Design a protein around this ligand. Structure first.
Ligand SMILES: Cc1cc2nc3c(=O)[nH]c(=O)nc-3n(C[C@H](O)[C@H](O)[C@H](O)COP(=O)(O)O)c2cc1C
Length: 173
């Protein structure tokens, strides 16, 4: 079973989370907003997790999403043993408004989950979007899939569907 966990402030992330669900069909559970998670142990009942979050707190070291993820990452996640579970991160941002901080929240989610033993998958080509810098680019790769739903430089559906496919291939789920 594949799980989809996200959070949002203005609902853009929700749209993306729903779309992933549609591409996966019966293989995925309906997306769950992190704010709705009582038991963080639920995260472990899946074979693969798609995690999504926007970036709202520009330049912040921690709590970059400005969503329920900010509390969840530090108060709840530390209690979950995620050894070997693959997680694929998608993040929403604005390459035009924040050229130097493009989808910075991806790195935070990546690092927090990695610390729990999770295995990040679904890296993407940092060249897809035009931006100057991001904390989410490491070793020549984006640590997840960045999306710009503000400027729509790249049609969302085709980009996400291709990424989902790559993730399913990589993980064998
Ligand atoms: C106040 C504000 C700050 C933002 N900061 C960033 C940022 O630092 N980096 C980025 O890539 N996008 C930034 N954005 C863009 C948001 O991530 C984007 O609008 C996103 O689609 C919102 O996702 P949501 O509707 O799920 O909350 C910011 C937007 C606003 C309004």
């Amino acid at each position: 079973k594949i799980g989809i966990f996200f959070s949002t402030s203005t609902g853009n992330t929700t749209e993306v989370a729903d779309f992933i669900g549609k591409t996966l069909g019966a293989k995925a559970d309906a997306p769950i907003d992190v704010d709705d998670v009582t038991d963080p142990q639920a995260l472990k009942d899946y074979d693969l997790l798609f995690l999504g979050a926007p970036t709202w707190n520009t330049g912040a070291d921690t709590e970059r999403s400005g969503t329920s993820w900010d509390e969840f990452l530090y108060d709840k996640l530390p209690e979950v043993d995620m050894k070997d579970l693959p997680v694929a991160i998608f993040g929403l941002g604005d390459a035009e408004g924040y050229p130097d901080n493009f989808c910075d929240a991806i790195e935070e989610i990546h690092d927090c989950f990695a610390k729990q033993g999770a295995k990040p998958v679904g890296f993407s080509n940092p060249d897809d979007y035009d931006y100057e810098e991001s904390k989410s680019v490491r070793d020549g790769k984006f640590l997840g899939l960045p999306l710009d739903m503000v400027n729509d430089q790249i049609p969302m559906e085709k980009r996400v569907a291709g990424w989902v496919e790559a993730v399913v291939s990589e993980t064998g789920v």
